[PDB]
């Protein structure tokens with residue numbers, strides 16, 4: 200005689216159930232997904248035999264399924280898995296991601312919300328998420344996986360956090376240094392232009408990152424040098440799996456410095472020639488949010504044994520990327536990206552991401568995609584990103600967004616920006632916790 204182990208549940212950080220089993224009959228255990236598609240990218244689905252088919256149902260199947268007993272060997276019932284997700288935040292973010300996808304016309308949209316201090320994954324969502332309460336064979340038109348961890352992209356100008364962090368950390372510039380930024384330069388044998396044409400502009404270091412000057416980024420990166428720049432790429436976790444605890448995580452791709460060509464250093468600081476996942480991208484800004492200490496993100500908070508005893512997941516080791524002073528200085532600078540100016544001069548690239556009364560800080564991203572037919576960049580196909588911190592003066596949440604080639608803003612207005620989706624999510628996070636509420640920053644001197 201077999202005594203079957205009962206499958207454990209999957210719950211969010213507050214024990215709100217995402218997946219649980221009810222007993223029924225044809226002896227038939229039926230998996231329940233009360234939220235339908237809610238976080239199904241993470242949770243996954245069940246197979247005909249009641250074991251996991253994909254997602255965490257599959258990757259944690261041994262934990263969740265337990266071991267059948269016999270009569271004597273006692274049945275070891277499945278343990279319950281406690282995720283770091285907050286279902287309230289997941290539900291709002293997942294809805295907003297879907298409508299940002301409909302409104303922008305992007306091929307796909309994804310977003311990640313991390314706790315600023317611990318790096319725990321509070322929300323991880325993509326558009327078009329499948330429904331694990333329905334048979335997977337009817338859902339070829341749905342997203343069955345978890346692109347936020349599986350599908351890397353070239354960061355483009357969201358990668359400029361690395362250059363900014365390195366020039367401040369090594370004492371090579373300051374936010375208010377007045378620079379002289381030509382409209383193009385030749386570097387490493389190639390020519391780099393700014394996304395707008397201009398003669399020599401007196402951007403401050405703040406303005407180089409606030410206006411996203413490719414040329415200004417590269418001039419500053421020349422002060423850093425290849426070795427210190429590459430070292431900082433690695434400290435930020437790029438090119439390495441985070442170990443978040445989800446199946447199918449990609450490591451991204453960073454060319455090691457001993458394989459660089461003459462043009463590599465002219466490309467990497469502006470986010471071309473390397474790739475990262477949305478989670479890695481968001482993890483970078485968490486380092487700066489956490490006063491320079493990167494905590495690799497985790498989605499498994501704890502497991503609860505059948506006797507009800509809870510064991511917390513072990514916290515990952517810290518990585519000191521920059522000093523606390525550097526991190527605080529970088530957060531303040533990135534406030535310029537969301538700064539509005541009717542006269543244009545002191546406006547960053549993402550003013551719609553700002554939330555009045557809060558010190559929102561972040562960075563817009565644009566990156567050309569690669570044309571499969573030529574092995575060369577598309578002229579007009581982009582990954583659009585936004586990464587930000589709520590808030591600069593008191594980091595609580597880190598939010599990362601990617602839009603795959605939108606035709607409009609995330610809210611449907613003309614343009615291509617992901618900044619309004621950050622506005623919606625960050626502002627909602629502030630209001631729902633009743634977070635309580637200087638002079639304008641100088642991006643462009645005389």
Ligand SMILES: [Co+2]
Nearest residue numbers: 606613614615
């Ligand atoms: Co356009």
Ligand SMILES: [Co+2]
Nearest residue numbers: 554622623626
């Ligand atoms: Co608003």
Ligand code: NA
Nearest residue numbers: 437438451475
């Ligand atoms: Na990477």
